[PDB]
Amino acid sequence: PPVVVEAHQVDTFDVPGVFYENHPHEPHLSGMNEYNQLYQQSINDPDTFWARMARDLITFEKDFDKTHIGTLEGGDNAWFVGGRLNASFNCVDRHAMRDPNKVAIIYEADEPGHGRSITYAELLKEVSRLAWVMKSQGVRRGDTVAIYLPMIPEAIFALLACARIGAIHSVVFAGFSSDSLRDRTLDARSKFIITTDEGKRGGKVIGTKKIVDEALKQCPDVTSCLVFKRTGADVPWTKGRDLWWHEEVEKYPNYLPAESMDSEDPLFLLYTSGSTGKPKGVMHTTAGYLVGAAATGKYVFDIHPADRFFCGGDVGWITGHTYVVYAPLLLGCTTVVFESTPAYPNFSRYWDVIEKHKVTQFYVAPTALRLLKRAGDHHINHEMKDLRILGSVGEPIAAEVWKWYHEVVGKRQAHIVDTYWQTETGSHVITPLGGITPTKPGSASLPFFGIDPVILDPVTGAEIPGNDVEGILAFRKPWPSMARTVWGDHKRYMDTYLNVYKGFYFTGDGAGRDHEGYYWIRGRVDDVVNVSGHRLSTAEIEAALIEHHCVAEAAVVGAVHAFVALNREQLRKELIMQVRKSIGPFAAPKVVFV
Numbered sequence: 048p049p050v051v052v053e054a055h056q057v058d059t060f061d062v063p064g065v066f067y068e069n070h071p072h073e074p075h076l077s078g079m080n081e082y083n084q085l086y087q088q089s090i091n092d093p094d095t096f097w098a099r100m101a102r103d104l105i106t107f108e109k110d111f112d113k114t115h116i117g118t119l120e121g122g123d124n125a126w127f128v129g130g131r132l133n134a135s136f137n138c139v140d141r142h143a144m145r146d147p148n149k150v151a152i153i154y155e156a157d158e159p160g161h162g163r164s165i166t167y168a169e170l171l172k173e174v175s176r177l178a179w180v181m182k183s184q185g186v187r188r189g190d191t192v193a194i195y196l197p198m199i200p201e202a203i204f205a206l207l208a209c210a211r212i213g214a215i216h217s218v219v220f221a222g223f224s225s226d227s228l229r230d231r232t233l234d235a236r237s238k239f240i241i242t243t244d245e246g247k248r249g250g251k252v253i254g255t256k257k258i259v260d261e262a263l264k265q266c267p268d269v270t271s272c273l274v275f276k277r278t279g280a281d282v283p284w285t286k287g288r289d290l291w292w293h294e295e296v297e298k299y300p301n302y303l304p305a306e307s308m309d310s311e312d313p314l315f316l317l318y319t320s321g322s323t324g325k326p327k328g329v330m331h332t333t334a335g336y337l338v339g340a341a342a343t344g345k346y347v348f349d350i351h352p353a354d355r356f357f358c359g360g361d362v363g364w365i366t367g368h369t370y371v372v373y374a375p376l377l378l379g380c381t382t383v384v385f386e387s388t389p390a391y392p393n394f395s396r397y398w399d400v401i402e403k404h405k406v407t408q409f410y411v412a413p414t415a416l417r418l419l420k421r422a423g424d425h426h427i428n429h430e431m432k433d434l435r436i437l438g439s440v441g442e443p444i445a446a447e448v449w450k451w452y453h454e455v456v457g458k459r460q461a462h463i464v465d466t467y468w469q470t471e472t473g474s475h476v477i478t479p480l481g482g483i484t485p486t487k488p489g490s491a492s493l494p495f496f497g498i499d500p501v502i503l504d505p506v507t508g509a510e511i512p513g514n515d516v517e518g519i520l521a522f523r524k525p526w527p528s529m530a531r532t533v534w535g536d537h538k539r540y541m542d543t544y545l546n547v548y549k550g551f552y553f554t555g556d557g558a559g560r561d562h563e564g565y566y567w568i569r570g571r572v573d574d575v576v577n578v579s580g581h582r583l584s585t586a587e588i589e590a591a592l593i594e595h596h597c598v599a600e601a602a603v604v605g606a607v608h609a610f611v612a613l614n615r616e617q618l619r620k621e622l623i624m625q626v627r628k629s630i631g632p633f634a635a636p637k638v639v640f641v
């Protein structure tokens with residue numbers, strides 16, 4: 048009888064031998080022996096291991112005094128204390144100083160055959176003069192800055208310009224409604240917001256400026272709204288508040304000094320929905336987050352400086368934060384900013400992009416892979432000679448989809464890396480290491496460096512030791528890129544993550560660890576449901592539906608559904624519009640019951 052039934056008779060797949068033959072460089076680890084050696088040091092002497100890793104990967108303005116203080120139960124963890132650094136220096140300046148004409152960003156626009164490439168020197172200029180705009184409009188170190196931007200390179204300019212002056216960027220997914228944008232801007236107390244006149248995605252127009260205008264009536268602390276002219280459409284304009292990106296940046300110099308930030312100064316807020324109530328502003332600080340981003344970029348995704356890294360995620364979510372922006376730029380390679388969808392103009396789009404730009408690592412969600420698999424294999428007829436790493440994030444990749452990814456997309460030539468992590472962990476925590484770790488379809492494999500996973504009994508909270516076990520997934524030790532608080536609400540941070548099982552970090556996920564020690568993520572044990580790549584609160588959908596006058600009691604379960612007690616076919620459609628106003632289109636239920 049097998050406790051972890053999903054692993055019954057599943058063999059490990061070695062890295063394809065052709066991966067090493069075709070590799071342009073020498074990979075970072077010699078094999079699984081070195082992983083085990085480094086992993087054991089990361090658990091048994093994290094002070095030594097992470098000091099060396101941080102000093103390898105991150106340039107500090109002032110070296111740090113101590114690797115880590117605090118404990119999980121104390122909720123007081125600090126990493127690289129005494130250090131000083133700047134995230135934009137590490138993502139931009141240090142690379143522009145060595146190789147100014149190296150391409151940092153490839154922008155792939157909604158329409159094929161547009162876009163452009165941006166060098167590290169060009170990125171330094173744009174980050175600098177955008178930072179000048181913010182400084183000139185009164186943004187100071189420690190202020191938050193709301194960002195409501197689509198996938199254009201200007202989004203990277205905005206994150207890194209905020210980091211350059213020590214402002215705390217608070218990115219809001221550009222598909223959120225006015226109410227959601229308002230809620231996040233109010234909670235973050237931002238006085239400055241950055242957006243576009245409109246977005247273009249999949250040939251469709253998104254009225255970003257209109258949505259922002261609606262949200263800002265209820266954000267009177269916002270006194271500046273910088274608008275990037277993406278489409279040039281006539282948009283309403285608020286004199287004295289609104290500013291044109293292109294008019295303002297050209298007033299200011301092409302260089303700006305970077306603020307000397309503490310290791311533990313906040314870098315950003317990322318609002319995420321939890322099991323109960325209002326969105327949590329998950330706060331990441333500076334040094335530990337960047338160290339985790341660079342370490343996983345390097346050792347999980349096998350990133351080398353010449354690589355062309357393509358994450359299909361959106362900057363509005365943590366995957367885009369860590370792997371579109373911070374990790375590849377920290378490591379000095381090229382990152383791809385993709386404005387379109389995998390289906391526009393046709394289902395070949397992902398592969399057209401990878402082929403044209405010779406992408407070396409591609410990172411997407413299984414939801415997109417399932418869509419494309421249903422579309423048919425004739426859409427894929429691309430050499431994609433340099434594609435050696437195929438990443439998957441957000442949900443377990445099913446053996447049927449894993450095989451299609453490995454064979455049809457990767458030509459049995461690429462290593463498939465199923466990365467498990469969350470907004471709160473900053474970077475990958477359970478994952479194979481690209482080009483190193485043997486994999487199992489449907490399994491996230493083994494812990495990353497510094498991650499000490501344990502399986503707990505959900506009721507008694509006790510550790511369940513050894514292999515072939517199942518239960519709650521928790522981590523036993525702090526790690527550098529862990530979220531440090533929930534903005535304005537440290538007690539909620541403690542209660543949610545650290546007080547449930549004292550001494551451990553609670554992921555909210557169930558998991559099994561099979562006879563080989565490989566982990567298999569079972570999904571959320573709480574009321575978080577994943578629909579089409581989004582982390583949505585069933586209570587948030589419940590609260591939205593209830594706000595309608597004819598709805599009394601509302602229940603939402605997970606494709607989310609909604610059984611409500613109140614024409615009955617007319618009301619079924621009217622509740623959807625109420626969700627569209629409270630959250631956004633991507634949170635409307637798939638069926639509405641009465």
Ligand SMILES: CCCOP(=O)(O)OC[C@H]1O[C@@H](n2cnc3c(N)ncnc32)[C@H](O)[C@@H]1O
Pocket residue numbers: 319365366439440441442443444465466467468469470471491554555556568570571581582
């Ligand atoms: C990392 C981007 C998604 O970040 P979020 O904070 O939005 O969601 C994290 C949650 O997604 C699932 N999850 C994430 N990665 C995996 C994964 N690879 N396998 C299974 N479930 C996964 C797990 O339930 C987890 O608690």
Ligand SMILES: [Mg+2]
Pocket residue numbers: 263264265266267
């Ligand atoms: Mg007002």
